[PDB]
Amino acid sequence: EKERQNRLAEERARREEEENRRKAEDEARKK
């Protein structure tokens, strides 16, 4: 269970950092 939950949690965090770098490069284009 913990293996599964941690795997899903890192998948979530990776998607989150994807969106963060994405908004970052968007703002960069606005610059």
Swiss-Prot record:
Domain of life of the native organism: Eukaryota
Function: Troponin T is the tropomyosin-binding subunit of troponin, the thin filament regulatory complex which confers calcium-sensitivity to striated muscle actomyosin ATPase activity.
UniProt family annotation: Belongs to the troponin T family.
Name the UniProt record assigns to this protein: Troponin T, cardiac muscle
Disease: Cardiomyopathy, familial hypertrophic, 2: A hereditary heart disorder characterized by ventricular hypertrophy, which is usually asymmetric and often involves the interventricular septum. The symptoms include dyspnea, syncope, collapse, palpitations, and chest pain. They can be readily provoked by exercise. The disorder has inter- and intrafamilial variability ranging from benign to malignant forms with high risk of cardiac failure and sudden cardiac death. Cardiomyopathy, dilated, 1D: A disorder characterized by ventricular dilation and impaired systolic function, resulting in congestive heart failure and arrhythmia. Patients are at risk of premature death.
Native species: Homo sapiens
Tissue specificity: Heart. The fetal heart shows a greater expression in the atrium than in the ventricle, while the adult heart shows a greater expression in the ventricle than in the atrium. Isoform 6 predominates in normal adult heart. Isoforms 1, 7 and 8 are expressed in fetal heart. Isoform 7 is also expressed in failing adult heart.
